[PDB]
């Protein structure tokens, strides 16, 4: 199926507490592969997935030097933005940046991204087709004019459409054993007496990869939403994901309800029903 | 692999 590579950067000012904090994480699909934290002792970009450790010293030296340059630019931006907004010298603020690319099933470029946020709100971002900028306010307009004089959009697209897609493919191949693995969900259904006239049915989907999945309830063959609860997809902690959907039903009528599970790892969607 | 050059806001 589709694939993506993405880098997430977070910088937080810490008034009277040293340099701001800088954290960088890298992901391929739903798998983190690299890390950098300005407070850790190593001061190295570090591996977080097995396949990336096959890269040599030049790679790690280069990625470390690039992520450090990145931390230095964000440390400056924190001061610039405070200036644009005429803000607190001793107040804590946050700058986030995300960039990367999406490729289809055949591994060909689909789209790219480069977005920036200040204090959890959109600041400036490249539009969907990468050919122009979206600037939130007068401050972002100041950034936008500087970025257009330096031809930043063009610099990024060269990376987002070429280099980014080239490394995503390199990683997917080297880490094929885990990155191109499809782990169908292990499923089951639980049953609890809620009260004198009700019973709860909980449909589970466990140990699945990638995270994209669909859990739904039907009653008498028709979609059911009344008295239902669907939790956010969550990480198991071992590289896999979990998710569940529940429904409250009248006691004695639980077999009229069915749970449908759709995931890329299943050659055919599964249908669960309460079997006492 | 990370982007190498980043322009300040």
């Amino acid at each position: 199926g589709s694939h993506s590579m993405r880098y997430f950067f977070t910088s937080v000012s810490r008034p009277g507490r040293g340099e701001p904090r800088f954290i960088a994480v890298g992901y391929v699909d739903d798998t983190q592969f690299v890390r950098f934290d300005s407070d850790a002792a190593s001061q190295r970009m570090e591996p977080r997935a097995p396949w990336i450790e096959q890269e040599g010293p030049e790679y790690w030296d280069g990625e470390t030097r690039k992520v450090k340059a990145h931390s230095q630019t964000h440390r400056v931006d924190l001061g610039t933005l405070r200036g644009y907004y005429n803000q607190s010298e001793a107040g804590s603020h946050t700058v986030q940046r995300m960039y990367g690319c999406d490729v289809g099933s055949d591994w060909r470029f689909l789209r790219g991204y480069h977005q920036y946020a200040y204090d959890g709100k959109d600041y400036i971002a490249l539009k969907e087709d990468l050919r122009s900028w979206t600037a939130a306010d007068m401050a972002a307009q100041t950034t936008k004019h500087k970025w257009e004089a330096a031809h930043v959009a063009e610099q990024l697209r060269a990376y987002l459409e070429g280099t980014c897609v080239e490394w995503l493919r390199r990683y997917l191949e080297n880490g094929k054993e885990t990155l191109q693995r499809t782990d169908a969900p292990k499923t089951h259904m639980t049953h609890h007496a809620v009260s004198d006239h009700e019973a709860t049915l909980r449909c589970w989907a466990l140990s699945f990869y990638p995270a994209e999945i669909t859990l739904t309830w039907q009653r008498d063959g028709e979609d059911q939403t009344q008295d239902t609860e669907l939790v956010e997809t969550r990480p198991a902690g071992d590289g896999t994901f979990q998710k569940w959907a529940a429904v409250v039903v009248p006691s004695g009528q639980e077999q009229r309800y069915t749970c449908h599970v759709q995931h890329e790892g299943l050659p055919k969607p599964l249908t669960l029903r309460w079997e006492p | 692999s990370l982007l190498m050059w980043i322009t300040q806001c």
Partner: T-cell receptor, first 114, second 113 residues
Framework: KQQVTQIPAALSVPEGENLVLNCSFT??????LQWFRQDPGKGLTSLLL?????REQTSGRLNASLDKSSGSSTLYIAASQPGDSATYLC?????????????FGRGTSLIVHP | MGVTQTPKFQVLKTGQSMTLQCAQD?????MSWYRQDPGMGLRLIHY???????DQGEVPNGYNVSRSTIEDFPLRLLSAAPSQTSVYFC????????????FGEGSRLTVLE
């Protein structure tokens, strides 16, 4: 690895002549190309700055372009003057290597006779 | 404004230590030091892409640098030797924008026995 070559190495001409100095590089993946001037016993003065997205720049009688064949740049000096005499250095910066280190050529020593 | 190197000239005795200073007020992430002997080319000593980060160039032997603030990048000659007689240049830039390099005026050191 990047190698910057500048031809001609030395250039001696009468004033008023239009000059063409060349700066070629082996690794076309560059972030920028910068031309400088250096006179004997003095520092370096930046003259022009070009990039793959802003391929030409002009400063008076000087203009440099980042040629179509992605491995060369030309510096043009119109109506040369004895004041133009100096060593012209060209340097490029990397777009992908993760080091950011510039690579300089050996320079072109120019003498413009009055 | 721009890049300021100090001192511009200096005479050292063999074995003395010396620190050359270099400051910039442009918020440049990148700072570097070069040496260039008379009529020869520029040789990179050390450079820095960020505070707390330094790396070696072509000739780091006999020199030390530190980057504790974004503005300053001092070059320390540990123990002066006659072979360190040269012209030293500090150069800085943004690691973005145009990447344009900005050179200081130069520092001329002569080491004598």
């Amino acid at each position: 690895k990047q190698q910057v070559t500048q031809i001609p190495a030395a250039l001696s001409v009468p004033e008023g002549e239009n000059l063409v100095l060349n700066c070629s590089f082996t690794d076309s993946a560059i972030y920028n190309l910068q031309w400088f001037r250096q006179d004997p016993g003095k520092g370096l003065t930046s003259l022009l700055l070009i990039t793959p997205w802003q391929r030409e720049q002009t400063s008076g009688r000087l203009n440099a372009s980042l040629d179509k064949s992605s491995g060369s740049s030309t510096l043009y000096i119109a109506a040369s003057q004895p004041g133009d005499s100096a060593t012209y250095l060209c340097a490029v910066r990397p777009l992908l290597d993760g080091t950011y280190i510039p690579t300089f050529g050996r320079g072109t020593s120019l003498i413009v006779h009055p | 404004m721009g890049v300021t190197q100090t001192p511009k000239f200096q005479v050292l005795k063999t074995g003395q230590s010396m620190t050359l200073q270099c400051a910039q007020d442009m918020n440049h992430e990148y700072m570097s030091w070069y040496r260039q002997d008379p009529g020869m080319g520029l040789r990179l000593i050390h450079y820095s892409v960020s505070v707390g980060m330094t790396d070696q160039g072509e000739v780091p032997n006999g020199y030390n640098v530190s980057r504790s603030t974004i503005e300053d990048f001092p070059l320390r000659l540990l123990s002066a030797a006659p072979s360190q007689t040269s012209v030293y240049f500090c150069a800085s830039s943004y690691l973005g924008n145009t990447g344009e390099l900005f050179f200081g005026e130069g520092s001329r050191l002569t080491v004598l026995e």
